[PDB]
Design an enzyme around this catalytic site. Structure first.
Site, mmCIF file in Angstrom:
data_model
loop_
_atom_site.group_PDB
_atom_site.id
_atom_site.type_symbol
_atom_site.label_atom_id
_atom_site.label_comp_id
_atom_site.label_asym_id
_atom_site.label_seq_id
_atom_site.Cartn_x
_atom_site.Cartn_y
_atom_site.Cartn_z
ATOM 1 N N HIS D 6 54.680 4.780 135.800
ATOM 2 C CA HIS D 6 54.100 5.957 135.199
ATOM 3 C C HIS D 6 53.953 7.167 136.106
ATOM 4 O O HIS D 6 54.393 8.230 135.733
ATOM 5 C CB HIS D 6 52.774 5.583 134.599
ATOM 6 C CG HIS D 6 52.877 4.554 133.525
ATOM 7 N ND1 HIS D 6 53.003 3.209 133.771
ATOM 8 C CD2 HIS D 6 52.840 4.689 132.179
ATOM 9 C CE1 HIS D 6 53.040 2.555 132.624
ATOM 10 N NE2 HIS D 6 52.932 3.430 131.641
ATOM 11 N N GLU D 78 47.577 2.577 139.186
ATOM 12 C CA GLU D 78 48.746 2.901 140.012
ATOM 13 C C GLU D 78 48.361 3.565 141.319
ATOM 14 O O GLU D 78 48.886 3.218 142.378
ATOM 15 C CB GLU D 78 49.784 3.686 139.237
ATOM 16 C CG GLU D 78 50.332 2.846 138.095
ATOM 17 C CD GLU D 78 51.602 3.382 137.468
ATOM 18 O OE1 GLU D 78 52.035 2.750 136.466
ATOM 19 O OE2 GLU D 78 52.079 4.442 137.915
ATOM 20 N N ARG D 166 30.284 14.046 115.656
ATOM 21 C CA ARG D 166 30.668 15.337 115.150
ATOM 22 C C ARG D 166 30.900 15.191 113.644
ATOM 23 O O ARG D 166 31.539 14.234 113.203
ATOM 24 C CB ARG D 166 31.951 15.836 115.836
ATOM 25 C CG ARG D 166 31.745 16.298 117.257
ATOM 26 C CD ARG D 166 33.016 16.632 117.982
ATOM 27 N NE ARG D 166 32.841 16.677 119.435
ATOM 28 C CZ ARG D 166 32.550 17.776 120.104
ATOM 29 N NH1 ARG D 166 32.402 18.922 119.478
ATOM 30 N NH2 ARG D 166 32.435 17.741 121.411
ATOM 31 N N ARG D 221 26.069 22.300 122.628
ATOM 32 C CA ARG D 221 25.959 22.254 121.150
ATOM 33 C C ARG D 221 24.532 22.202 120.708
ATOM 34 O O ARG D 221 24.256 22.420 119.525
ATOM 35 C CB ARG D 221 26.773 21.064 120.531
ATOM 36 C CG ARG D 221 26.430 19.670 120.994
ATOM 37 C CD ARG D 221 27.553 18.673 120.756
ATOM 38 N NE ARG D 221 27.559 18.174 119.378
ATOM 39 C CZ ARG D 221 28.008 17.001 119.030
ATOM 40 N NH1 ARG D 221 28.553 16.208 119.936
ATOM 41 N NH2 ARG D 221 27.915 16.619 117.769
#
Lengths: 223, 251, 223, 251, 223, 251
Positions: D6, D78, D166, D221
């Site tokens: 990756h 990794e 949410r 929020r």
């Protein structure tokens, strides 16, 4: 039209009965009823066959429950709607304890809740315990006929390891007790259970017969 | 084994049938079987009644499962050891969606596993999914006779009362984890409740067997209007025709 | 400013599209789009690369989902907010069933929910099932090009035993399906999934290419 | 292995670096690396972009994780096989506590594990805790540049929408077990939500690696006033300075 | 009458104290208190023995917690009701990491929640983390007396495999930390924990004594 | 072993006793023992105080468990290795049922397992059931002195506060899964809350030991009237008489 969705019964059918003996299948229902007075077959729909009889002049109900918690839950709720407040289960089982012999009688104080239905009535933490009066009456009835009795825990699952429940002392396995006991103990209904030991992987219709007399005699003490 | 305890059948009785229609109630077996050729009764024990018949020349079986997962698992398992590889569940049900009407037909793609029995065949994470060929056959058969069909998810509960969040009961109450569950299932698109598909679908999906399910809607608790009590028996016949035509395509 | 938090798209960009093909990465997005008409790259933010194209005169969206349920959940919700109602997943996988060959195509009917994200949308008891129309369209498209197809269960986890899922018949593993299927089946959105078998531990870009044509051809049947 | 699929890196590319700064977004890698010495790009594949640089003479790495636990676990794993033993997560986040202001900085001591990936490294009972030396370094660095710092628990969720409760969404609803969860986390002192720290902290805490996390608050929020959309970019730079100064102390 | 159900204390007894050192048993309580100024025994009821003392002119509380989460939860809540906002646990443990030596000091950053009580305060997903200031103060106090210190994870259960927690790096086991840390971190209360390594299955009262000085010195930095 | 760490006893001290009365508080041990013959103190360490006495000529033990499941499990386990096979828990409790009055006596048939310790002896599915002979003895003894007795289910919680859904606390709040739990237990017939019976009953039921439990009701939070603070001490004496008479029948 009956007053209930499955049993096909109306309140009048019970003639005031508040106790029901609840075996698994119709064949056993008739046998139980036949021990009592004025036995009358009331209905038969699917797994649910109900007879009415009298014990010492009082009406009692005998109604098959079918297989497993699911079917038991239906018969139990519908009988309760009809006025039943005391339920006594009778069956035949296989023991898993070496000191338990065929012919002996098992009175369940509480069940290992390995089923699914019991959870629709209470969280797993709630114990599937038998009512004290009912257990007493069963123990006394067994004693009244000289039965060798064991009083303890029964394992109840939806499937038709053995070593682990054996070390925990569970006496035997079956599929309906966790549901019966949980749904009764969590709703102010009294329940008790007795089973005849017909096998012990660790003579046979007589055992069943002796278990039948015992549930009937316990009923007599509970009315 | 060459026989099975509960059904009371030997393999030879099935004459090599590999498909079975499985209604729940033994009283509806003969009628489903009568729709096909050479219908004959094989056995009848407890709620396990089975008949054999012929469809397009091939032996087919009809066998009742009784009520609930445990009873159903005993039937399927025995039929499976007798050679059945394809199971078509046929039933009558209530709906929990307003846009679903009595007389409509529901074909189940997968079920919400609100039971105990299914767990003995696969862990909860495994989907109680219906076989694609079976579902396809059932949907095309419904379309064949012009039925109004709904294809989706069914909720399979171990109880008829608290698990379907019924409050019309002795206690009048429902355990915590089930309080408000009906509304959730509804908002999530669940079509109806029944009690046996979780174990049937999971058993088959996990054991390389094919299973599918169809049911006619005979009531709808979200609707104010009560069933025509006419249209109900018509619905049962309707469903029976569907499941037979579906078997025809799966032979 | 886009109408959504991550995709960087506005409703107008979709030009009325209600179907989206959702591969894992941008490279595949362009490939898919390139099979269709009037392909246009709309946005690229983080893992989310969205192109717009046309199928038989109707606009369709192609949008990368990134790795895992988490990232998929974002693309799926945001595409839904933008008007997408049908989602088709295309990928390449390794099969775990001996009878499945490289080059074959796998159409998922439902997924084993071994992820975390699927639970934010429904309790584990809810099945991660593919929409019937979508599965049908995929099976028919595969058939239309002579592909050998397997239709069944896929195991979906967050990790990048094998023997147990193999006995249960699961055809393969991947990381996004449980989320996609669950979030769609529990919200009235239609989802389907097809994967090309590029390995079977029990020739390779052609498979992917054949899987790409198949998702596109299924889309054509779904609009 | 001496390479990793990756990231597209070989161990030699890292020149023996054992510390990595891990932002989520590959577009912010170069900028973090540019703050240090001899910044060079090593690779770039998918959302995994990594650069190398020097701090006080020691090679250091900057590599993006992408979005979510699964993507993050692939990066950390990794980098770990390439020799990284110390990971500093740097991010931008929203807050859920009224007393927390945009421009403030959050340093995470442990995370509520609302994800799936973390469970593959340790059972739920195991805490997604941050390494003490890392947390210490990050807190002292924030104090160094005079930031307003909050030290505590972060909620790490596999979704951006229902898991952070949410309701501004397609469905407008949230599954049962998440209904009201935001208020609970708040009353319990949780500072904010993000999506990758559960897997990062658990992986490292369970594998003898050091990990720490800092984030700048760009929104809130629970507050009516909207961010200065000025102070936001300032906050990101702010956080970057913090994480670099913290690495300086962990060399 | 005290202001609390179990401790047998009134708010006035604490004379404004906001910090409490919380060992397991009364014997240790007196030892701790004896390190400080103006030590006074306030109450003793069941497992809960509380002394009051002064650190640099400020009053501090020392109160035994008893065995396990259950008993700890009571002392912790009641002390909080009385005004305590900072709790420091001191104990002696056995290490399970080969690199940890007897005599070394263990400062817990967070605990593996294997108990029952911690769940009455927060779902298992919530981390049982120690407050940063408290952990810092403990690490600095240990350093102040030249102790060899390890800072990490502690496993906490209700029972009085080892190999698995060892591979996960857990330093040791005990029974009260998951409860203390969880109940504090989820209620805006500050908690920290230090233990002396008296055994390592992988010299002894001195360790305890050195652990006692360290909790006291940390307290001094926290007031 | 021939001694035990926590209790500080040797087997010989028990003179072959196989029954123990286990109160929670060491200060109530002497008084229970004084009711019987030849009462002698054996040990006293932490909250584990034990005395020996004679009943109808047979040695009997009285030993305190301390507070909570963990502390209780240490006591039972040690007494069990010292030869005790029958345990009678005696306590004072609050009730959560309106029809239960202070001065009444509760005999427990099984407990709701809201604890951690019990789980080390058997999985949750196993019932925390009381031995029938013990329960029988306790019920008949209560009837002997004319007490008003309630026989049923007790809820055993690891906390005194949130687990018994008390809101009179520092936080004033209760975690999600416990919110509304008190009302559920009530509607389900639970008589009261306490903190040790889950581990005691499960340990014994799963290990072939007999255990039973009785408690006098000294308060009732569902009732407006406050206890007579007279009737409370009378209730404790009352309960003590019951448990002793019950032991008499289990010798």
């Amino acid at each position: 039209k009956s007053d209930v969705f499955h049993l096909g019964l109306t309140k009048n059918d019970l003639q005031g009965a508040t106790l029901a003996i609840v075996p698994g299948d119709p064949d056993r229902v008739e046998k139980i009823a036949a021990l009592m007075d004025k036995p009358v077959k009331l209905a038969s729909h699917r797994e649910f066959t109900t007879w009415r009889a009298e014990l010492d002049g009082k009406p009692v109900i005998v109604c098959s429950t079918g297989i497993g918690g699911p079917s038991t839950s239906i018969a139990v709720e519908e009988l309760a709607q009809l006025g039943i407040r005391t339920f006594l289960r009778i069956g035949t089982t296989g023991a898993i304890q070496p000191h338990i012999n065929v012919g002996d009688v098992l009175v369940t104080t509480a069940s290992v809740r390995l089923d699914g239905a019991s959870l629709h009535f209470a969280p797993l933490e709630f114990p599937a315990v038998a009512d004290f009066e009912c257990t007493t009456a069963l123990v006394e009835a067994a004693k009244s006929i000289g039965a060798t009795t064991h009083v303890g825990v029964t394992a109840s699952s939806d499937t038709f390891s053995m070593e682990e429940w054996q070390a925990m002392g569970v006496m035997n396995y079956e599929m309906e007790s966790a549901t019966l006991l949980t749904m009764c103990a969590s709703q102010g209904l009294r329940a008790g259970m007795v089973a005849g030991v017909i096998v012990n992987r660790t003579t046979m219709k007589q055992t069943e017969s002796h278990a039948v007399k015992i549930v009937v005699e316990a009923a007599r003490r509970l009315l």
